[PDB]
């Protein structure tokens, strides 16, 4: 019941301002899992469980989006310790994050970028429907299930419950925050999320982020370093509109002509993942 009596702790996988995750195996079915640790001190936002229970905001959000949809990692269970919380997350294999995939393969072909981007749009949408706003959409927070060709949104450590009123707080990735944040320290979830989606898309087709400094983010001029179709460039420029109100809705993004005829997850893997190239 403790924890070790259920899971077999393995080596260290990753770590950062979000936590320290270790490889793990569940005893009973040797099901591959990821064990994430978080110190109660490092925690900034807390929440109440559906049964009123002081817990990390991450746990709250994870349980709200944890169902059948394989678009976001599932929180299998969580434990509490005197100075930390432990999260048991599902862990697919083989797996590689979008950031390493991009760093390794470089700019992605548009066909593959369309499939990938489409899948994260569906995942983010899933979250919003469950009342969850991620706030840190970026290549590093997206895993690729190499065999299935399915992407998975991870790390809700900077999330928050979704609301229709302004947000005055933000502890996500700077280079992905919108010009409203940088200039006024306030924003709205959905439109701010669309902004990070545009950054992501650009990152997919160009191999790198488009902005580095606050002035670049505020100016909004987008220069393409790689050959990108006019439709894809237009979608990106549209998501990257300086004025939130001028950004497209998720519906408009998925209805955009560049977004059409997306490849099925399995076809994607068969065509772009199952290979040495």
mmCIF file of C-alpha atoms in Angstrom:
data_model
loop_
_atom_site.group_PDB
_atom_site.id
_atom_site.type_symbol
_atom_site.label_atom_id
_atom_site.label_comp_id
_atom_site.label_asym_id
_atom_site.label_seq_id
_atom_site.Cartn_x
_atom_site.Cartn_y
_atom_site.Cartn_z
ATOM 1 C CA UNK A 1 0.000 0.000 0.000
ATOM 2 C CA UNK A 2 2.845 2.462 0.723
ATOM 3 C CA UNK A 3 4.310 2.806 -2.770
ATOM 4 C CA UNK A 4 7.418 0.676 -3.200
ATOM 5 C CA UNK A 5 5.126 -2.207 -2.270
ATOM 6 C CA UNK A 6 3.232 -1.532 -5.493
ATOM 7 C CA UNK A 7 5.812 -0.156 -7.904
ATOM 8 C CA UNK A 8 9.420 -1.027 -8.670
ATOM 9 C CA UNK A 9 11.349 2.245 -8.766
ATOM 10 C CA UNK A 10 13.815 2.517 -11.613
ATOM 11 C CA UNK A 11 16.515 4.947 -12.780
ATOM 12 C CA UNK A 12 15.992 8.684 -13.231
ATOM 13 C CA UNK A 13 14.236 9.771 -16.425
ATOM 14 C CA UNK A 14 14.050 13.559 -16.349
ATOM 15 C CA UNK A 15 13.851 16.578 -14.034
ATOM 16 C CA UNK A 16 13.275 20.323 -13.891
ATOM 17 C CA UNK A 17 11.243 23.116 -12.337
ATOM 18 C CA UNK A 18 8.296 20.737 -12.531
ATOM 19 C CA UNK A 19 9.845 17.792 -10.691
ATOM 20 C CA UNK A 20 11.964 14.656 -10.695
ATOM 21 C CA UNK A 21 10.546 11.701 -12.608
ATOM 22 C CA UNK A 22 11.791 8.129 -12.434
ATOM 23 C CA UNK A 23 11.191 5.039 -14.533
ATOM 24 C CA UNK A 24 8.899 2.577 -12.828
ATOM 25 C CA UNK A 25 7.069 -0.702 -13.190
ATOM 26 C CA UNK A 26 3.788 -1.567 -11.522
ATOM 27 C CA UNK A 27 3.960 -4.811 -9.576
ATOM 28 C CA UNK A 28 1.038 -7.024 -10.652
ATOM 29 C CA UNK A 29 1.191 -6.500 -14.404
ATOM 30 C CA UNK A 30 4.650 -5.038 -15.004
ATOM 31 C CA UNK A 31 2.854 -2.058 -16.549
ATOM 32 C CA UNK A 32 5.366 0.680 -17.492
ATOM 33 C CA UNK A 33 4.900 3.801 -15.360
ATOM 34 C CA UNK A 34 6.537 7.137 -14.584
ATOM 35 C CA UNK A 35 6.910 8.196 -10.954
ATOM 36 C CA UNK A 36 6.901 11.976 -10.511
ATOM 37 C CA UNK A 37 8.001 13.579 -7.253
ATOM 38 C CA UNK A 38 7.198 17.105 -6.139
ATOM 39 C CA UNK A 39 8.241 18.861 -2.911
ATOM 40 C CA UNK A 40 5.436 20.554 -1.015
ATOM 41 C CA UNK A 41 7.626 23.654 -0.754
ATOM 42 C CA UNK A 42 8.227 23.949 -4.497
ATOM 43 C CA UNK A 43 4.452 23.831 -4.922
ATOM 44 C CA UNK A 44 2.895 27.248 -5.521
ATOM 45 C CA UNK A 45 -0.729 26.485 -6.427
ATOM 46 C CA UNK A 46 -2.934 24.134 -4.425
ATOM 47 C CA UNK A 47 -6.422 22.825 -5.018
ATOM 48 C CA UNK A 48 -9.233 20.754 -3.551
ATOM 49 C CA UNK A 49 -10.151 17.275 -4.742
ATOM 50 C CA UNK A 50 -13.742 16.503 -5.799
ATOM 51 C CA UNK A 51 -14.023 15.298 -2.195
ATOM 52 C CA UNK A 52 -12.417 18.374 -0.673
ATOM 53 C CA UNK A 53 -8.761 17.445 -0.151
ATOM 54 C CA UNK A 54 -5.732 19.751 0.038
ATOM 55 C CA UNK A 55 -3.605 18.695 -2.936
ATOM 56 C CA UNK A 56 -1.227 20.039 -5.633
ATOM 57 C CA UNK A 57 -2.972 21.844 -8.497
ATOM 58 C CA UNK A 58 -1.258 19.359 -10.801
ATOM 59 C CA UNK A 59 -3.119 16.418 -9.235
ATOM 60 C CA UNK A 60 -6.417 18.282 -9.476
ATOM 61 C CA UNK A 61 -6.014 18.996 -13.202
ATOM 62 C CA UNK A 62 -4.672 15.542 -13.999
ATOM 63 C CA UNK A 63 -7.632 13.745 -12.442
ATOM 64 C CA UNK A 64 -10.046 15.990 -14.356
ATOM 65 C CA UNK A 65 -8.494 15.108 -17.732
ATOM 66 C CA UNK A 66 -7.682 11.481 -16.933
ATOM 67 C CA UNK A 67 -10.137 9.257 -18.805
ATOM 68 C CA UNK A 68 -9.933 7.226 -22.000
ATOM 69 C CA UNK A 69 -8.611 9.757 -24.483
ATOM 70 C CA UNK A 70 -4.936 8.980 -25.005
ATOM 71 C CA UNK A 71 -4.180 12.594 -25.900
ATOM 72 C CA UNK A 72 -2.874 13.456 -22.441
ATOM 73 C CA UNK A 73 -0.852 11.344 -20.012
ATOM 74 C CA UNK A 74 -2.980 9.621 -17.390
ATOM 75 C CA UNK A 75 -2.533 9.995 -13.654
ATOM 76 C CA UNK A 76 -2.865 6.370 -12.531
ATOM 77 C CA UNK A 77 -2.595 7.239 -8.842
ATOM 78 C CA UNK A 78 -0.870 9.572 -6.394
ATOM 79 C CA UNK A 79 0.571 9.262 -2.899
ATOM 80 C CA UNK A 80 1.350 11.773 -0.194
ATOM 81 C CA UNK A 81 4.492 12.004 1.901
ATOM 82 C CA UNK A 82 5.420 14.464 4.671
ATOM 83 C CA UNK A 83 7.322 16.809 2.330
ATOM 84 C CA UNK A 84 6.229 15.696 -1.122
ATOM 85 C CA UNK A 85 3.588 14.142 -3.362
ATOM 86 C CA UNK A 86 4.220 11.256 -5.727
ATOM 87 C CA UNK A 87 2.389 10.876 -9.029
ATOM 88 C CA UNK A 88 2.118 7.597 -10.925
ATOM 89 C CA UNK A 89 1.728 8.387 -14.622
ATOM 90 C CA UNK A 90 1.325 6.013 -17.541
ATOM 91 C CA UNK A 91 4.496 5.674 -19.582
ATOM 92 C CA UNK A 92 4.371 4.475 -23.210
ATOM 93 C CA UNK A 93 7.351 2.898 -24.972
ATOM 94 C CA UNK A 94 9.096 3.564 -27.249
ATOM 95 C CA UNK A 95 8.708 7.284 -26.556
ATOM 96 C CA UNK A 96 10.533 10.524 -27.364
ATOM 97 C CA UNK A 97 9.529 14.125 -26.678
ATOM 98 C CA UNK A 98 8.805 16.518 -29.534
ATOM 99 C CA UNK A 99 11.828 18.597 -28.611
ATOM 100 C CA UNK A 100 14.335 15.752 -29.074
ATOM 101 C CA UNK A 101 12.496 14.552 -32.146
ATOM 102 C CA UNK A 102 12.824 18.043 -33.634
ATOM 103 C CA UNK A 103 16.414 18.471 -32.451
ATOM 104 C CA UNK A 104 17.246 15.114 -34.012
ATOM 105 C CA UNK A 105 15.304 15.265 -37.272
ATOM 106 C CA UNK A 106 15.146 19.030 -37.680
ATOM 107 C CA UNK A 107 12.232 20.845 -39.342
ATOM 108 C CA UNK A 108 9.334 18.464 -39.927
ATOM 109 C CA UNK A 109 7.638 17.855 -43.267
ATOM 110 C CA UNK A 110 4.267 19.605 -43.398
ATOM 111 C CA UNK A 111 2.358 16.326 -43.698
ATOM 112 C CA UNK A 112 3.862 15.165 -40.414
ATOM 113 C CA UNK A 113 3.544 18.607 -38.787
ATOM 114 C CA UNK A 114 -0.170 18.566 -39.705
ATOM 115 C CA UNK A 115 -0.749 15.189 -38.053
ATOM 116 C CA UNK A 116 1.193 16.162 -34.933
ATOM 117 C CA UNK A 117 -0.271 19.624 -34.623
ATOM 118 C CA UNK A 118 -3.738 18.175 -35.211
ATOM 119 C CA UNK A 119 -3.214 15.708 -32.384
ATOM 120 C CA UNK A 120 -2.105 18.349 -29.863
ATOM 121 C CA UNK A 121 -5.072 20.547 -30.890
ATOM 122 C CA UNK A 122 -7.348 17.615 -30.019
ATOM 123 C CA UNK A 123 -5.517 17.106 -26.712
ATOM 124 C CA UNK A 124 -5.664 20.779 -25.693
ATOM 125 C CA UNK A 125 -9.325 20.741 -26.713
ATOM 126 C CA UNK A 126 -9.853 17.678 -24.539
ATOM 127 C CA UNK A 127 -8.359 19.563 -21.585
ATOM 128 C CA UNK A 128 -10.453 22.707 -22.105
ATOM 129 C CA UNK A 129 -13.588 20.566 -22.243
ATOM 130 C CA UNK A 130 -12.631 19.163 -18.860
ATOM 131 C CA UNK A 131 -12.191 22.638 -17.405
ATOM 132 C CA UNK A 132 -8.408 22.472 -17.544
ATOM 133 C CA UNK A 133 -6.053 25.074 -19.017
ATOM 134 C CA UNK A 134 -2.503 23.753 -19.564
ATOM 135 C CA UNK A 135 -0.488 26.978 -19.913
ATOM 136 C CA UNK A 136 2.775 25.372 -21.017
ATOM 137 C CA UNK A 137 2.216 23.926 -24.468
ATOM 138 C CA UNK A 138 5.634 23.444 -26.087
ATOM 139 C CA UNK A 139 7.678 20.729 -27.764
ATOM 140 C CA UNK A 140 9.158 19.617 -24.395
ATOM 141 C CA UNK A 141 5.717 18.903 -22.915
ATOM 142 C CA UNK A 142 4.567 16.623 -25.720
ATOM 143 C CA UNK A 143 5.510 12.949 -25.964
ATOM 144 C CA UNK A 144 5.477 10.830 -29.088
ATOM 145 C CA UNK A 145 4.329 7.222 -28.931
ATOM 146 C CA UNK A 146 6.595 6.045 -31.766
ATOM 147 C CA UNK A 147 4.672 2.839 -32.532
ATOM 148 C CA UNK A 148 1.144 4.230 -32.354
ATOM 149 C CA UNK A 149 2.147 7.580 -33.848
ATOM 150 C CA UNK A 150 0.126 9.260 -31.092
ATOM 151 C CA UNK A 151 1.175 12.431 -29.233
ATOM 152 C CA UNK A 152 0.667 12.975 -25.501
ATOM 153 C CA UNK A 153 0.448 16.224 -23.589
ATOM 154 C CA UNK A 154 2.403 16.133 -20.300
ATOM 155 C CA UNK A 155 3.335 18.156 -17.236
ATOM 156 C CA UNK A 156 0.376 20.114 -15.919
ATOM 157 C CA UNK A 157 2.618 21.644 -13.265
ATOM 158 C CA UNK A 158 1.830 25.146 -14.569
ATOM 159 C CA UNK A 159 -1.820 24.546 -15.381
ATOM 160 C CA UNK A 160 -4.933 26.005 -13.803
ATOM 161 C CA UNK A 161 -8.683 25.495 -13.871
ATOM 162 C CA UNK A 162 -10.065 26.965 -17.099
ATOM 163 C CA UNK A 163 -11.959 30.230 -16.661
ATOM 164 C CA UNK A 164 -13.467 32.903 -18.898
ATOM 165 C CA UNK A 165 -12.125 35.834 -16.902
ATOM 166 C CA UNK A 166 -8.580 37.244 -17.025
ATOM 167 C CA UNK A 167 -5.519 35.512 -15.639
ATOM 168 C CA UNK A 168 -2.976 37.701 -13.885
ATOM 169 C CA UNK A 169 -0.625 34.865 -13.034
ATOM 170 C CA UNK A 170 1.647 32.856 -15.326
ATOM 171 C CA UNK A 171 4.541 30.539 -14.544
ATOM 172 C CA UNK A 172 4.822 28.847 -17.920
ATOM 173 C CA UNK A 173 7.526 29.216 -20.571
ATOM 174 C CA UNK A 174 8.377 32.858 -21.318
ATOM 175 C CA UNK A 175 9.224 32.484 -25.019
ATOM 176 C CA UNK A 176 5.771 30.907 -25.392
ATOM 177 C CA UNK A 177 3.796 33.549 -23.457
ATOM 178 C CA UNK A 178 1.685 36.013 -25.518
ATOM 179 C CA UNK A 179 2.357 39.728 -26.081
ATOM 180 C CA UNK A 180 -0.459 40.544 -23.624
ATOM 181 C CA UNK A 181 1.442 38.798 -20.839
ATOM 182 C CA UNK A 182 4.763 40.490 -21.586
ATOM 183 C CA UNK A 183 3.140 43.928 -21.956
ATOM 184 C CA UNK A 184 0.300 43.904 -19.421
ATOM 185 C CA UNK A 185 0.758 40.804 -17.287
ATOM 186 C CA UNK A 186 -2.787 39.660 -18.060
ATOM 187 C CA UNK A 187 -4.412 37.319 -20.592
ATOM 188 C CA UNK A 188 -7.277 34.979 -21.362
ATOM 189 C CA UNK A 189 -6.762 31.208 -21.441
ATOM 190 C CA UNK A 190 -8.023 30.165 -24.861
ATOM 191 C CA UNK A 191 -6.455 33.022 -26.808
ATOM 192 C CA UNK A 192 -3.192 32.735 -24.892
ATOM 193 C CA UNK A 193 -3.270 28.988 -25.675
ATOM 194 C CA UNK A 194 -3.719 29.667 -29.369
ATOM 195 C CA UNK A 195 -0.653 31.909 -29.239
ATOM 196 C CA UNK A 196 1.526 29.126 -27.863
ATOM 197 C CA UNK A 197 0.046 26.811 -30.518
ATOM 198 C CA UNK A 198 1.311 29.183 -33.196
ATOM 199 C CA UNK A 199 4.760 29.215 -31.620
ATOM 200 C CA UNK A 200 4.651 25.393 -31.531
ATOM 201 C CA UNK A 201 3.546 25.063 -35.173
ATOM 202 C CA UNK A 202 6.293 27.394 -36.298
ATOM 203 C CA UNK A 203 8.701 25.388 -34.163
ATOM 204 C CA UNK A 204 7.523 22.280 -36.015
ATOM 205 C CA UNK A 205 7.985 23.560 -39.558
ATOM 206 C CA UNK A 206 11.065 25.685 -38.893
ATOM 207 C CA UNK A 207 12.997 23.569 -36.419
ATOM 208 C CA UNK A 208 13.217 26.421 -33.948
ATOM 209 C CA UNK A 209 11.166 28.882 -31.932
ATOM 210 C CA UNK A 210 10.383 32.167 -33.721
ATOM 211 C CA UNK A 211 10.990 34.669 -30.909
ATOM 212 C CA UNK A 212 13.683 34.949 -28.275
ATOM 213 C CA UNK A 213 13.320 38.439 -26.765
ATOM 214 C CA UNK A 214 10.314 40.264 -25.362
ATOM 215 C CA UNK A 215 10.622 42.922 -28.042
ATOM 216 C CA UNK A 216 10.387 40.267 -30.766
ATOM 217 C CA UNK A 217 7.268 38.813 -29.147
ATOM 218 C CA UNK A 218 5.747 42.289 -28.839
ATOM 219 C CA UNK A 219 6.597 43.253 -32.421
ATOM 220 C CA UNK A 220 5.137 40.019 -33.763
ATOM 221 C CA UNK A 221 6.988 40.068 -37.104
ATOM 222 C CA UNK A 222 7.373 36.463 -38.182
ATOM 223 C CA UNK A 223 10.288 35.522 -40.414
ATOM 224 C CA UNK A 224 10.468 32.016 -41.834
ATOM 225 C CA UNK A 225 13.869 30.379 -41.981
ATOM 226 C CA UNK A 226 12.582 27.296 -43.797
ATOM 227 C CA UNK A 227 10.438 26.882 -46.891
ATOM 228 C CA UNK A 228 6.855 26.767 -45.626
ATOM 229 C CA UNK A 229 3.656 26.666 -47.674
ATOM 230 C CA UNK A 230 1.599 29.861 -47.828
ATOM 231 C CA UNK A 231 -1.363 28.168 -46.115
ATOM 232 C CA UNK A 232 0.758 27.026 -43.176
ATOM 233 C CA UNK A 233 2.441 30.447 -42.925
ATOM 234 C CA UNK A 234 -0.968 32.104 -42.853
ATOM 235 C CA UNK A 235 -2.265 29.828 -40.096
ATOM 236 C CA UNK A 236 0.848 30.570 -38.056
ATOM 237 C CA UNK A 237 0.661 34.310 -38.575
ATOM 238 C CA UNK A 238 -3.020 34.112 -37.659
ATOM 239 C CA UNK A 239 -2.400 32.301 -34.339
ATOM 240 C CA UNK A 240 0.372 34.795 -33.653
ATOM 241 C CA UNK A 241 -1.886 37.843 -33.968
ATOM 242 C CA UNK A 242 -0.818 40.583 -31.537
ATOM 243 C CA UNK A 243 -4.439 41.197 -30.508
ATOM 244 C CA UNK A 244 -6.026 38.166 -28.771
ATOM 245 C CA UNK A 245 -9.346 39.042 -30.391
ATOM 246 C CA UNK A 246 -7.691 38.637 -33.805
ATOM 247 C CA UNK A 247 -6.492 35.123 -33.117
ATOM 248 C CA UNK A 248 -8.533 32.241 -34.541
ATOM 249 C CA UNK A 249 -10.632 29.950 -32.364
ATOM 250 C CA UNK A 250 -9.802 26.249 -32.113
ATOM 251 C CA UNK A 251 -12.670 25.663 -34.521
ATOM 252 C CA UNK A 252 -11.169 28.094 -37.038
ATOM 253 C CA UNK A 253 -7.742 26.482 -36.713
ATOM 254 C CA UNK A 254 -9.100 22.984 -37.410
ATOM 255 C CA UNK A 255 -11.248 24.297 -40.261
ATOM 256 C CA UNK A 256 -8.332 26.168 -41.817
ATOM 257 C CA UNK A 257 -7.400 24.789 -45.256
ATOM 258 C CA UNK A 258 -3.884 23.820 -44.175
ATOM 259 C CA UNK A 259 -5.408 21.596 -41.499
ATOM 260 C CA UNK A 260 -7.411 19.430 -43.939
ATOM 261 C CA UNK A 261 -6.961 15.742 -44.726
ATOM 262 C CA UNK A 262 -4.882 14.979 -41.658
ATOM 263 C CA UNK A 263 -3.214 11.572 -41.522
ATOM 264 C CA UNK A 264 -4.458 8.999 -39.019
ATOM 265 C CA UNK A 265 -2.095 8.377 -36.078
ATOM 266 C CA UNK A 266 -1.148 4.895 -37.282
ATOM 267 C CA UNK A 267 -0.520 6.039 -40.874
ATOM 268 C CA UNK A 268 1.743 8.755 -39.500
ATOM 269 C CA UNK A 269 3.842 6.254 -37.566
ATOM 270 C CA UNK A 270 3.902 3.893 -40.538
ATOM 271 C CA UNK A 271 4.982 6.720 -42.846
ATOM 272 C CA UNK A 272 7.263 8.862 -40.644
ATOM 273 C CA UNK A 273 8.144 6.939 -37.493
ATOM 274 C CA UNK A 274 8.647 3.318 -38.556
ATOM 275 C CA UNK A 275 11.981 3.912 -40.261
ATOM 276 C CA UNK A 276 15.659 4.842 -39.943
ATOM 277 C CA UNK A 277 14.961 8.078 -41.820
#
